[PDB]
Each structure stands twice: as C-alpha cells, then as structure tokens.
Amino acid sequence: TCPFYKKIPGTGFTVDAFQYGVVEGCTAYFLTHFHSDHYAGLSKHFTFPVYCSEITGNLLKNKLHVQEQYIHPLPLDTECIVNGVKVVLLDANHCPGAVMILFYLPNGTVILHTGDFRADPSMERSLLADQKVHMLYLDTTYCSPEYTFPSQQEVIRFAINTAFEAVTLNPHALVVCGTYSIGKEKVFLAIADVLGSKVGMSQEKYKTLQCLNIPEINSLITTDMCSSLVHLLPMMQINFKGLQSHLKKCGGKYNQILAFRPTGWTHSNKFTRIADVIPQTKGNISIYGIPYSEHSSYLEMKRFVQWLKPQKIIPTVNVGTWKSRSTMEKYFREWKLEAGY
Numbered sequence: 001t002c003p004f005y006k007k008i009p010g011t012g013f014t015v016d017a018f019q020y021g022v023v024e025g026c027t028a029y030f031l032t033h034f035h036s037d038h039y040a041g042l043s044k045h046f047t048f049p050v051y052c053s054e055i056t057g058n059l060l061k062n063k064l065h066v067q068e069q070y071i072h073p074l075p076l077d078t079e080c081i082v083n084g085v086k087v088v089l090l091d092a093n094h095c096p097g098a099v100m101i102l103f104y105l106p107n108g109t110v111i112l113h114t115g116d117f118r119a120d121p122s123m124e125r126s127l128l129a130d131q132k133v134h135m136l137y138l139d140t141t142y143c144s145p146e147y148t149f150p151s152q153q154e155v156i157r158f159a160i161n162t163a164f165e166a167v168t169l170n171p172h173a174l175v176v177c178g179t180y181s182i183g184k185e186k187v188f189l190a191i192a193d194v195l196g197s198k199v200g201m202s203q204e205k206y207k208t209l210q211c212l213n214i215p216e217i218n219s220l221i222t223t224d225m226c227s228s229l230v231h232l233l234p235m236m237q238i239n240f241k242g243l244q245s246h247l248k249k250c251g252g253k254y255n256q257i258l259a260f261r262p263t264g265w266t267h268s269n270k271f272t273r274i275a276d277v278i279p280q281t282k283g284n285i286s287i288y289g290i291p292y293s294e295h296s297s298y299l300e301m302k303r304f305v306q307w308l309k310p311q312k313i314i315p316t317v318n319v320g321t322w323k324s325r326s327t328m329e330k331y332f333r334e335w336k337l338e339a340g341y
C-alpha cells in the first residue's frame with residue numbers, strides 16, 4: 001500500500017508510486033526521474049497515464065517499453081492543466097530529465113514536490129519567486145551538517161587534471177569510469193573531451209545515453225571499444241579484479257589503468273580536501289573515489305528552504321527511523337527560528 005508522503009491531497013495524483021499496484025483514487029501517476037527506486041513497478045503492461053519530462057518519457061518508451069499512449073511528456077517552465085489542476089515542472093539539478101513539480105490546488109494551497117534535487121541559488125529565479133508555497137515535499141538525503149562535499153565544477157576540475165596528467169606521462173594508459181544509473185555523465189564526458197577521445201561502452205549503455213537529449217552526442221560516444229581510450233563499465237567491475245580482467249581484453253593496447261568511481265558522500269569528506277584525494281593502487285591499476293553529488297549538501301538545502309519559507313515540510317528520504325525523523329524536525333525548527341518565518 002501507498003504511503004502518505006507519496007499522495008497529493010486534494011487531487012487524484014501520486015508521485016513516484018508505481019510499486020503498490022493500482023492505487024485507489026489515482027487518476028494520474030507522476031514520475032520525477034528515471035532512477036530505479038522511483039520508477040519501481042513500471043513495465044510494458046502499465047495502462048494508467050504517466051506524467052513526466054520529455055527525457056524521462058524517452059527512457060520509459062525505449063528502456064522499459066511502456067506504450068506510447070500512456071506516456072504524457074510536459075515541457076518545463078510552462079503552466080499545464082492536468083485533470084483540471086494547474087501544474088508546472090521545474091529542473092531539479094539532479095540527473096537528466098529530473099524534475100520538481102509545483103501543484104496549484106483547487107482550494108488555493110500551493111505544493112512543491114522536489115523529487116530528488118541538488119538545490120542551487122539559480123532556483124530562487126525560477127517560477128518559484130512569484131508566489132507562496134504552503135507544503136514542501138523535500139529530498140532530505142543529506143539533511144545533517146556532517147554532510148559536506150565540493151561543487152560539481154571542482155570535482156570535474158580534479159578529474160580532468162588527474163586524467164590529462166596521467167595519459168600525458170603515459171600515452172599507453174586507459175581511463176575507465178564506473179556507472180550504474182543515469183546521472184553524473186559530466187565525469188566521463190569531460191575526461192574524454194580533454195583527451196580527444198570518444199567514450200566507449202556497451203550496447204545497453206549506449207541505448208540509455210541516446211535517450212537523453214545531449215547536444216552533439218553522436219560526436220561523443222561509441223560502441224567501438226577499440227577506437228576509444230575512455231571506457232565505461234558497470235560500477236561493480238570497478239575493483240582490482242574487474243579491472244585486471246578488463247585490461248586482458250584490450251589485446252596489449254594498454255599497460256596501465258586509471259579508474260574513477262563516482263560516489264555520493266563518504267566519511268573521508270570529513271577530513272580530506274578534494275585537492276588532497278589519493279587513489280588505491282595495485283601494480284599498474286589505480287582507482288580514485290570522487291564525491292560527485294547529485295543531491296543537496298546540508299548548507300545548500302538549508303539555504304533553499306530558508307529562502308522558500310514553506311509553512312510545512314514533509315521529508316521524503318530517511319523517513320524509516322524515529323531517530324532520523326526527530327533529527328530532521330529539529331533542524332527544520334532551527335532554520336525557521338533563525339530566519340523568522
């Protein structure tokens with residue numbers, strides 16, 4: 001059965017609620033983004049209307065085979081009526097196609113559901129500037145002050161400089177980048193661009209990237225592994241065993257691997273600056289863990305919420321323990337007393 005925080009009061013609508021079977025009273029199912037925890041339950045046998053971005057729509061049709069008649073894509077930054085209710089989709093600064101949804105309820109209440117997001121000051125000049133929000137359904141993944149990490153720009157600067165240095169010293173090194181979902185594509189795209197290479201990958205991953213509306217993508221990626229010195233591999237293969245095994249397959253073209261594992265936050269964030277990050281090394285194989293986040297830091301979250309001044313907050317992440325729920329409520333009360341709403 002569908003939990004409360006996935007229902008939108010005063011509407012026939014749910015958000016990211018496909019794993020509960022037919023939800024009683026649901027006339028339209030919203031999908032914020034194409035990540036498996038959120039789409040869990042969709043397939044070619046789904047026969048209710050799905051509302052989402054154009055990009056999420058491309059992925060539902062091609063990767064999950066949802067039939068076209070049930071896919072309803074909406075443009076961003078545009079007032080749309082759905083089953084007699086005004087809605088707007090906004091860029092969430094998460095993975096490709098990810099949105100936040102503004103719902104303008106028939107009774108005058110305004111609700112923002114962030115989906116998954118990485119809060120940014122640019123959001124303070126979207127259509128959010130224009131009006132009040134009574135309820136905020138908030139991505140609270142990193143809602144605790146220990147969660148610090150650098151900007152995406154600094155993380156990419158580090159990865160580019162690391163890769164370019166290593167391959168310039170050794171033209172016979174291969175670069176490998178881990179992936180398990182959409183998102184974080186800038187890591188592998190930026191590295192390939194500095195090196196003058198296309199990114200090589202499996203047929204399945206190539207298919208997924210071809211759904212994303214990335215400008216000039218055909219110039220950036222390929223299934224021909226042999227032409228490419230930046231390869232993508234599933235994240236589970238990014239270890240000394242997996243990588244040895246991959247170097248065997250390359251037919252003595254390369255004598256060194258440098259690999260990148262994009263993670264979210266890890267505890268080594270609490271001590272080490274991005275500049276000072278070092279790899280794990282065994283022989284001619286090195287592996288860097290880099291903290292490229294597509295979710296708000298604590299400070300980014302706090303800034304957004306203090307700016308929006310919502311009347312009520314409903315967390316959508318870390319909701320399963322009493323201690324988590326209590327901790328989050330404490331921070332919402334400080335933020336409110338500090339800013340005066």
Ligand code: NI
Nearest residue numbers: 033035094116
């Ligand atoms: Ni996500």
